[PDB]
Design a protein around this nucleic acid. Structure first.
Length: 61
DNA sequence: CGACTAATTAGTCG
DNA sequence: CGACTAATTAGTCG
């Protein structure tokens, strides 16, 4: 397996700020966001999956 | 095709 | 240890 990414406080703040406004990203958005943070689109896509899952599990807790 | 999901697996750190 | 969460799996979706 791929080693676990360690997000810097800057990348996490940015992802969290974006998620407040955009829960699902369009492809061009995902590309722009990932490039802005020095990440791959896969790392961004997986962060959004996991963040959506965090919210859903709270909803069903 | 490649988005999504729930479930799972496994690393981080208070 | 345990909440958290990054990465993987095995499906669905029109």
């Amino acid at each position: 397996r791929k080693p676990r990414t360690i997000y810097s406080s800057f990348q996490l703040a940015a992802l969290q700020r974006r998620f407040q406004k955009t829960q699902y990203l369009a492809l061009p958005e995902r590309a722009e966001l990932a490039a802005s943070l020095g990440l791959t689109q896969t790392q961004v896509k997986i962060w959004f999956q996991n963040k959506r899952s965090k919210i859903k599990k709270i909803m069903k807790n």
